Design a protein around this motif. Structure first.
Motif, PDB file in Angstrom:
ATOM      1  N   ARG A 278       6.395   6.851  -2.797  1.00  0.00           N
ATOM      2  CA  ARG A 278       7.053   5.727  -3.439  1.00  0.00           C
ATOM      3  C   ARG A 278       8.472   5.621  -2.906  1.00  0.00           C
ATOM      4  NH1 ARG A 278       4.716   8.497  -7.790  1.00  0.00           N
ATOM      5  NH2 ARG A 278       6.785   9.286  -8.365  1.00  0.00           N
ATOM      6  N   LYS A 279       8.878   4.417  -2.534  1.00  0.00           N
ATOM      7  CA  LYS A 279      10.256   4.245  -2.129  1.00  0.00           C
ATOM      8  C   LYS A 279      11.169   4.275  -3.348  1.00  0.00           C
ATOM      9  CE  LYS A 279      10.812   1.608   1.422  1.00  0.00           C
ATOM     10  NZ  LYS A 279      10.501   2.432   2.619  1.00  0.00           N
TER      11      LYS A 279
ATOM     12  N   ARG B 238       1.876  -5.031   2.014  1.00  0.00           N
ATOM     13  CA  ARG B 238       1.982  -3.605   1.660  1.00  0.00           C
ATOM     14  C   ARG B 238       0.938  -3.318   0.612  1.00  0.00           C
ATOM     15  NH1 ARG B 238       8.341  -3.401   0.592  1.00  0.00           N
ATOM     16  NH2 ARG B 238       7.682  -5.226  -0.628  1.00  0.00           N
ATOM     17  N   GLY B 239       0.698  -4.249  -0.299  1.00  0.00           N
ATOM     18  CA  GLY B 239      -0.421  -4.113  -1.213  1.00  0.00           C
ATOM     19  C   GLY B 239      -1.739  -4.022  -0.472  1.00  0.00           C
TER      20      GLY B 239
ATOM     21  N   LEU C 270      -1.824  -3.073   2.698  1.00  0.00           N
ATOM     22  CA  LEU C 270      -1.641  -1.772   3.335  1.00  0.00           C
ATOM     23  C   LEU C 270      -2.087  -0.649   2.413  1.00  0.00           C
ATOM     24  CD1 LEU C 270       0.163  -3.249   5.548  1.00  0.00           C
ATOM     25  CD2 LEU C 270       1.848  -1.491   5.150  1.00  0.00           C
ATOM     26  N   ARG C 271      -1.579  -0.649   1.179  1.00  0.00           N
ATOM     27  CA  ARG C 271      -1.849   0.434   0.247  1.00  0.00           C
ATOM     28  C   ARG C 271      -3.323   0.552  -0.101  1.00  0.00           C
ATOM     29  NH1 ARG C 271      -2.356   1.573  -4.515  1.00  0.00           N
ATOM     30  NH2 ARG C 271      -2.349  -0.654  -5.043  1.00  0.00           N
TER      31      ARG C 271
ATOM     32  N   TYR D 129      -4.990   2.808   2.559  1.00  0.00           N
ATOM     33  CA  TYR D 129      -4.512   4.176   2.712  1.00  0.00           C
ATOM     34  C   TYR D 129      -5.026   5.129   1.645  1.00  0.00           C
ATOM     35  CZ  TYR D 129      -1.271   3.004   6.452  1.00  0.00           C
ATOM     36  OH  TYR D 129      -0.716   2.613   7.648  1.00  0.00           O
ATOM     37  N   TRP D 130      -5.625   4.631   0.566  1.00  0.00           N
ATOM     38  CA  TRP D 130      -6.133   5.508  -0.478  1.00  0.00           C
ATOM     39  C   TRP D 130      -7.650   5.523  -0.578  1.00  0.00           C
ATOM     40  CZ3 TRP D 130      -8.861   4.646  -5.062  1.00  0.00           C
ATOM     41  CH2 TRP D 130      -9.058   3.314  -5.436  1.00  0.00           C
TER      42      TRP D 130
END
Length: 270
Positions: free
Chosen positions: A187-188, A225-226, A228-229, A232-233
């Motif tokens: 998390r940024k 990014r959503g 993207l995310r 990645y999971w």
DNA sequence: CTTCAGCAGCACGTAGGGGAGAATTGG
RNA sequence: CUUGCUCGGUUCGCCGAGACUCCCCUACGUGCUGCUGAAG
DNA sequence: CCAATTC
């Protein structure tokens, strides 16, 4: 195919009062408030062009500029199926009734008793239908509307998208992100989860992956990014992708939600 | 001042209708 | 594992552990609310 | 190259 829901960064106009949404709305109300004899009469919907200038000239439903067949073909197939549903459920209810009605008629042979009185049939309307549903504001995106990387279109790369957060422990002290010395041993820092209000207690825009979905003189710039995310999971891809590559995994045809200000994507069959 | 009566929802379930492409071929 | 959602820690510098098949509509349920009619 | 056509 689970959804990959992505936010909206900027929009030309809210999703409402939009050619496709507005013209769909007019179509919705006409179909649902129809008669069982005016459904097989006012509905002659063909997957072609001159018929949708015939159906939209016979039904009277207006168009403020929307003539796109690819998006005026599922719009007119949504409503007709939805209206079909409100009769299908009643028929199934009636069918369920006559399934057990036959069942209780089977026990009559063992009963040696007078047969049960006929089970009544539920009528979907006693000419307008009883349950005229409300409009579905969801906006569906077709092939001519499919997403593309934002490459000025009115900051993005299709170069390899940054991995993001490469340095956490090397941030200078006082700069955003430094792990405190007392808890030093993704998390940024602007993640709202870490700065929310709790019982004990532009950056996003400048570090975005902007895709764009266009409908005529209209467009939506989702934050990928959503998207993207989502990859990645689930165990599909790794850090090596690009604005071109991720959209390859996800269906060309995304969905839109005017109310929550969020768009929805779907995995392809693979 | 209590039983219930049957509609409605701030809020909640279930239960059941609808939806979530993309590869060619014209002008 | 860059955004977003839930719940925790703190020296408030961001840190720890997670969720992720969703959305739309009609309607029917439970306390609650209201409107009424019985029995002293 | 961008709308209309296909299943």
């Amino acid at each position: 195919c689970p959804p990959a829901k992505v936010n909206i960064l900027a929009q030309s106009r809210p999703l409402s009062e939009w050619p496709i949404n507005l013209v769909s709305k007019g179509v919705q109300e006409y179909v649902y408030g129809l008669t069982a004899a005016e459904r097989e009469a006012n509905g002659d919907f063909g997957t072609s062009r001159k018929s949708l200038d015939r159906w939209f000239a016979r039904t009277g439903v207006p168009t403020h500029g929307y003539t796109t067949v690819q998006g005026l073909n599922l719009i007119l197939r949504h409503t007709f199926n939805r209206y079909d549903g409100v009769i299908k459920k009643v028929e199934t209810r009636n069918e369920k009734r006559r399934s057990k009605a036959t069942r209780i008629n089977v026990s009559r042979e063992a009963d040696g008793l007078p047969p049960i009185e006929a089970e009544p049939e539920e009528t979907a309307f006693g000419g307008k239908l009883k349950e005229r549903p409300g409009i579905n504001p969801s906006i569906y995106c077709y092939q001519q509307v499919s997403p593309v990387p934002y490459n000025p279109h009115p900051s993005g790369v299709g170069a390899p998208l940054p991995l993001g957060t490469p340095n956490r422990l090397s941030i200078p002290k006082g700069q955003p992100g430094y792990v405190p010395e007392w808890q030093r041993p993704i998390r940024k820092w602007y993640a709202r989860a870490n700065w929310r209000r709790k019982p004990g207690r532009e950056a996003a825009l400048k570090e975005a992956i902007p895709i764009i979905v266009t409908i005529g003189k209209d467009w939506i710039v989702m934050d990928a990014r959503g998207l993207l995310r989502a990859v990645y999971w689930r165990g599909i891809a790794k850090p090596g992708l690009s604005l071109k590559e991720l959209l390859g995994f996800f269906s060309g045809d995304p969905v839109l939600d005017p109310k929550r200000g969020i768009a929805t994507f779907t995995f392809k069959l693979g």
